[PDB]
Every structure is written in structure tokens, then in C-alpha cells.
Structure 1
Amino acid sequence: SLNNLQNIIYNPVIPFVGTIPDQLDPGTLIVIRGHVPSDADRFQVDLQNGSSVKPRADVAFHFNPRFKRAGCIVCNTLINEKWGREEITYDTPFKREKSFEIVIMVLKDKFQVAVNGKHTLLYGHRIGPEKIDTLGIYGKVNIHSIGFSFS
């Protein structure tokens, strides 16, 4: 059959703020397929505790490809409206005008992210993943599909 992921969302409007339909237990996958527009400066995928804007929802995991200069991916955590220490990954596979697949795997102590079938980065948990119930996608990105595999 054609359904290999759960709770699939197709061609969402960006910015996208959606409820994650089950718990992010170890082994859970979040799978996002899309493409970067030619003028992209950045986009972000945020795993959030709720969707409030005041106070702004905590972001357990901010995954933020940036396209200026040589490009990079910045990761961070937002707690009580304050950003923490950035973790920057310089070996970035994202490119303007190219399509991508992001697979975020939740593990016990960290997230692991693979892009286009290749391991890209790790990010240690700073907020318990049990607090995450919302997926936010913002910025200059086109999203084809979002799906989940819940453990």
C-alpha cells in the first residue's frame, strides 16, 4: 500500500502549526519532505510545548537551516522565552532550489536527524520530549508532506 507513515499532512500552508497526534517516545520518527525556494534565507522546524505566542511556547528542539554564505544548520532550545546556547552544524545538505527529506528520530537522551538518507546531526534533550505536542514549520520553505512513525 501507499501509506507507510501515520497521521500524514499534505501540502500544508506555511507557517504550519499542528498538533502531534501521539507521544514522542524513543524510536519515534517525524518525516518531513519539501523543497527550498531560490530566495530562502532560512527556515525552521520547531518541536514545541503547545502553540502559545504569549508567553511564546517553549521550543524543545529548534532545527534551523540557514542559507547565507556557505550555509549551516543552527539548533537550539527556547525555555520561558529565552534562547539557549546554539549548536551549529556546518556540514549542511540543504540547498536553495533543491528538494529534501528530513527524518527526526527521538532517542532516550537526544534527537538524531538524517537528511536525504544521510546522518546529519545529534541534539541532546534540554526539555523532556514528553512536553512536546506541537510541530511548527516557519520561514522560506515549501512542505510537501509531514508524517509520523510512533513507537
Structure 2
Amino acid sequence: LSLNNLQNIIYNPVIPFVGTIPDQLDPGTLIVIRGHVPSDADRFQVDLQNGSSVKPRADVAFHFNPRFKRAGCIVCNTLINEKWGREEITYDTPFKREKSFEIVIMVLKDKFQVAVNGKHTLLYGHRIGPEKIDTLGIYGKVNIHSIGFSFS
């Protein structure tokens, strides 16, 4: 699966980052996030959100949260009407402190498919319609090299 036609590319964004996604996340669209975690980082998160409201809090369709303590994990969840759901934890994680990642989030009709550095990482079934997603948030101790979208 190819990373062709990446557009609206932002390099070295300031973190915390909150940015409007330039087009609708229809099936087969990609979000590509490249970066690395510093040596003192314990976690970071990527949030695909319905808007950028703070109070009331924006719904988070997809919360993708690598954690680095010990052998590490990835926590995924959704926030609806200011309440987190039950998390889905993935223990087979490719993330390491000081190791770079290319996170590819592919939106399908029924789920997100996430790959890191060209290798499948996890699936996450939609709990909110992906058509409602228009905002990308990135928070925590993380150095983001680039953010890009594939709509074409």
C-alpha cells in the first residue's frame, strides 16, 4: 500500500499541535505522521477529533497513545460527550525511545488500520463516524518531523 500523493505537509510543527484536517477522511485516505520520541518521553498521543472545542470537550473518534514504560504498549480509545470509552491495548508495539516512526493511519469504512514503518501495527473499529473527523491533535513529549494527508 503506497504513500503517494501526500499533500498539505507541515514540517516540524510545535507540540502541542492542533490542526484542521484539509479534507474529509473518506475510505482509503491516509494520515501520515513521522517523528520520534525523546529519551525522557514516557508517552504521546495522536487524537482524531470532531472539532477543536475545549469546553465542551471535542469528541475524539480515535485516540492513539504509545506508552514507553518497560516493554511498552499502545492504548487506543474514543471520547464521546466528554467521557472516555473502554481502551483497547496493543502489546506488540514497534515504538522505542529515540527510534523514529512513520505512522500511517488508513481510514476504512468500518475501522482504522494503522501501520508503523511499513509494518501493520493495529486495527481499531469506528465508534464515531469518520466523516465527523476534521481535526488532528498531537500532544506529549514527541518530536514530530512531518504531518501529511493523502486525499488523491
Q: TM-score, normalised by structure 1?
A: 0.97
Q: Report the Cα distance in structure 2 between the residues aligned to 1:18 and 1:69, rounded to whole angstroms.
A: 32
Listed one character per residue, the Cα deviations across residues 25-53 of structure 1 (whole Å, up to 9, x for unaligned) are 00000000001100111000000001111
Q: Report the Cα distance in structure 2 between the residues aligned to 1:107 and 1:37, rounded to whole angstroms.
A: 31
Q: Report the Cα distance in structure 2 between the residues aligned to 1:26 and 1:128, rounded to whole angstroms.
A: 11
Q: TM-score, normalised by structure 2?
A: 0.96
2:139 aligned with 1:150, yes or no?
A: no
Listed one character per residue, the Cα deviations across residues 79-129 of structure 1 (whole Å, up to 9, x for unaligned) are 011000100000000000111100000000000000011000000000000
Listed one character per residue, the Cα deviations across residues 49-90 of structure 1 (whole Å, up to 9, x for unaligned) are 011110111000000000112100000000011000100000
Q: Give the percent of matched residue pairs that are identical in Structure 1 and Structure 2.
A: 100
Corresponding pairs, count: 151
Shift of 1:4: 3.9
C-alpha spacing 1:132/1:2, structure 2 compared with 1 (3 Å): closer
Paired residue secondary structure (2:13): coil
Q: Report the Cα distance in structure 2 between the residues aligned to 1:147 and 1:43, rounded to whole angstroms.
A: 18
Shift of 1:3: 8.6
In structure 2, stretches of 5+ residues that fail to align are none
Shift of 1:150: 1.0
In structure 1, what is the equivalent of residue 133 of structure 2? 132
